[PDB]
Amino acid sequence: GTVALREIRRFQKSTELLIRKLPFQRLVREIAQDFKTDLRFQSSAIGALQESVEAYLVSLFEDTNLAAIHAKRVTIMPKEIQLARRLRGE
């Protein structure tokens, strides 16, 4: 059979946080240098930030996907993103 695998190992589909650790860390140190030069980033408490940012993003894509299906279209234009930004309140 070719379905039961997709039934017994697909009882648990989760998906994960993805933004790469080293590039993200380099980026945040880069935008932290100008705010305060020689800012030593503690290697802890950065996973919590790197989960919170992704959470807010996936909220933004779910809102823009709702807006997209509201426009009978699957692709994303800048209009959806900017109105999501404005209507959320920032």
Next chain:
Amino acid sequence: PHRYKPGTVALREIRRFQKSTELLIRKLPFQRLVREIAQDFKTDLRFQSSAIGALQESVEAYLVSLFEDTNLAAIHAKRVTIMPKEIQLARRLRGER
């Protein structure tokens, strides 16, 4: 016949309101609604007219903010007429309830 095309006076009249700042809701029916929705809890409430004025201003402000937001949500699509879809989307987006 001095009949203008649909919407010709609409822009003018919108300008007239958005210039103005007065009470857009008649006070007496608002009092009726407030009493109807408040008598379901306790008698002898003894409302003070300033309070009902306060909630009147609050509700009109909330409604105009809502309506401008749904106007933006509608002008998103190739639509200039408002339907329940935009209102529901605006209500759900901000997560009011």
Next chain:
Amino acid sequence: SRSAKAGLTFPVGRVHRLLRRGNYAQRIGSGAPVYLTAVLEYLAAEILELAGNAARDNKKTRIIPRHLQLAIRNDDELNKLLGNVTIAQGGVLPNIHQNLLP
């Protein structure tokens, strides 16, 4: 007075009594208890200047509440500071969509 010696004009002692009654801390910072009044004085000066300008724009001598409304709403920084709060008998800036025009 204390405000005069400080160059301030808001009554500092009233705010000191208010903070003492509020008991936000057992021993409030007495090094500069009028400093929190000074920042509020600066913000009040900003908003009062904007309101006076707005009232002067429409030839009205007195501060119309609507004049204050557009004074605060025009400033993007002011809108970010206070945007979730409405003003009684306020208004809305005339915003007509360009593509809406016939």
Next chain:
Amino acid sequence: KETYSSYIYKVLKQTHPDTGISQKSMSILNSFVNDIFERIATEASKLAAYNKKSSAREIQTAVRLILPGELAKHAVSEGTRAVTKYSS
């Protein structure tokens, strides 16, 4: 009862000597001043609870994240100038 009409009146008078006021606007300003005071003061209280302990640094920092930075630097600078004037 101690109203705050006199202080806002004289501030308007030192920034606009020929502009009047309206009664509704007086309550508007009073409520604005009161609620901004309370907001920043409870922010200072939570900033005092921030540090593992029981001044002016707390209030400066509290005004430093509550309102947009552009006006925040002016606020802190003028507050410091005020305390320097009051020091002696």
Next chain:
Amino acid sequence: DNIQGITKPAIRRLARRGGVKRISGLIYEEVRAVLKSFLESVIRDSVTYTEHAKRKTVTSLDVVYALKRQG
């Protein structure tokens, strides 16, 4: 000058996380803009926490305290 570090397939799987397999040609630039408009604030709050911590090292409590104010 490393904002471009976030790669395009990263954005594509980010969109895949939220559903819909449709992706534009500048949605990556847009999400770069929104992260530049979000993370600068969520690290500026931590900067203010460090200023009001007398502390040169960011800790978990300070950064989470500065972060939770978003909502």
